[PDB]
Design a protein around this ligand. Sequence first.
Ligand SMILES: *[C@@H]1O[C@H](CO)[C@@H](O)[C@H](O)[C@H]1NC(C)=O
Ligand SMILES: *[C@@H]1O[C@H](CO)[C@@H](O)[C@H](O)[C@H]1NC(C)=O
Lengths: 166, 441
Amino acid sequence: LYFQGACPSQCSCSGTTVDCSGKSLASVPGGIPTTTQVLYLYDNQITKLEPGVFDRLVNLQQLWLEINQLTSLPAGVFDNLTQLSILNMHTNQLKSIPRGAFDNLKSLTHIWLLNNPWDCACSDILYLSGWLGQHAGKEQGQAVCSGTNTPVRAVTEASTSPSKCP
Amino acid sequence: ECSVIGYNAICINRGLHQVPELPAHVNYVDLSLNSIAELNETSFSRLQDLQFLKVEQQTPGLVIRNNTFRGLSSLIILKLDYNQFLQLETGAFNGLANLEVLTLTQCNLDGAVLSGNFFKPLTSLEMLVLRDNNIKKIQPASFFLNMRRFHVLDLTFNKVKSICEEDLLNFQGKHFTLLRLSSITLQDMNEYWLGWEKCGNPFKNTSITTLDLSGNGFKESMAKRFFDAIAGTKIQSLILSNSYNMGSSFGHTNFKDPDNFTFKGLEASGVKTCDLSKSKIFALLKSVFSHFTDLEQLTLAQNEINKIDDNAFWGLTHLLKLNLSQNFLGSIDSRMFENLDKLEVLDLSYNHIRALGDQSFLGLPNLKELALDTNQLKSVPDGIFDRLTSLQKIWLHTNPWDCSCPRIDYLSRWLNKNSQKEQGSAKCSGSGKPVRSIICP
Ligand SMILES: *[C@@H]1O[C@H](CO)[C@@H](O)[C@H](O)[C@H]1NC(C)=O
Ligand SMILES: *[C@@H]1O[C@H](CO)[C@@H](O)[C@H](O)[C@H]1NC(C)=O
């Protein structure tokens, strides 16, 4: 009902892989084993992440969050994922990334950010645009600014304003 | 006698009376269906680390002594269900500061298990399953305020008298991902109860992703008072299936159908999905769903719906999926599905539909999936489907289609040109050939 062995009942588990994809999930399942190295959460209906949801998953090598409805990220949500190399967040509802969100991800090599409505008129975009400028090779596809098609990487501080942040 | 395979030790139904000596490196241990009468500090002296421990359905009266789990710093899930007359000493869960999941289903526990200090050490606890006990009032002690990661509580099948603001005081400020209050009756919360004003809002300053209130009767007058009481609570998915008292049903009943006031308290709740299936709704009244302005999925499957009044779907400007399967619809007309411009999936299967009105699906320009199988349709009007230009899947099988010409000319021709979209193939009654294959002279 909640657990089939140690695997969350809504997910399918094999080895150190936990597959919760395509299960119409509204939130991240509880009880994901701490040995998990690969976590699939794509193609669900997750609208937010609770702070610390990934804090115990120190062994994660891949995190697949694409095809959801995420509208923001909690501060620090990736800080403990130092082995993380793959972080996929395309096709969500993100407008910006919290300052320093990727600071701790020293093993990151592939990140997907395209197909999100990045709000580049608002100065909150500036962490991501600067980060993209310094880590250009990691992005798969091209995150683009909403309503102008201008890649996020090209954002200048002159183009932004704090007053255009709804 | 246990089966050890890698890090898993399976000891189900081995006639064990104590924790046996097993290799010290295992992280999954299942001790269910044995005769262990008492667990103490020596029980898990050698099985340290450990991540997953199951001790379900021992002989009646399992005792868990103080400091039983001290040292099990890797333990994440602890399952102890179906232990009749479970006796917990107050330090039974000492040392489990990292535990995230605890299940204590069907253990004859009462409300003191929440108000006492049993769970005070579980500071990292995230999910607590207390299904099918004797909890009559839900009164979490104040230390639940510091369980910063507590987000799943399941109290299904507890005979809860009522839930009120002061009961749930120590859940305030929390965001539950799942709060399952299914089949708890809430017997005191009827229309005559003097306690309503003192009850306040049980979910004050609390948000819930999935609120499961299935199997509670939910007479119309009760749903109205309850959602008025919890007005403003942010809820993404509302589950009200198996509300056997909600609809007024087919045939003389004493209950009323919901109207435009029943769900008014949820106006600002941001509900995205609502499950009202397996109830006894007979008529969809005007603006009954007009307060679900963010709703994206609505199922009314397996009710007793015979009538849909005008503007029943008023306000559902964002609704994407409507499931009306297994009801008693008699005929479909253009008026019935107004105010659903964005609808993409419509399930009308397993109904009693014998007629489609000329413009039945006019106001659904974005419709992708339409199920009409297992009804009693013999024919359709010419052009009924020509404007569904986004359509991808349609079900028309298991109907007694009258395939006479030229009556069937439109449908037979339309199904052939669009043969890649038909799911299950519609068949002529009598001959049994696919409707898509008939070419009228
Ligand atoms: C267990 O610990 C509690 C802590 O308050 C103590 O009062 C009790 O005497 C101890 N022993 C038993 C058998 O409960
Ligand atoms: C409609 O509800 C029935 C009953 O649960 C289910 O079998 C079916 O898959 C549902 N269809 C859609 C499109 O939601």
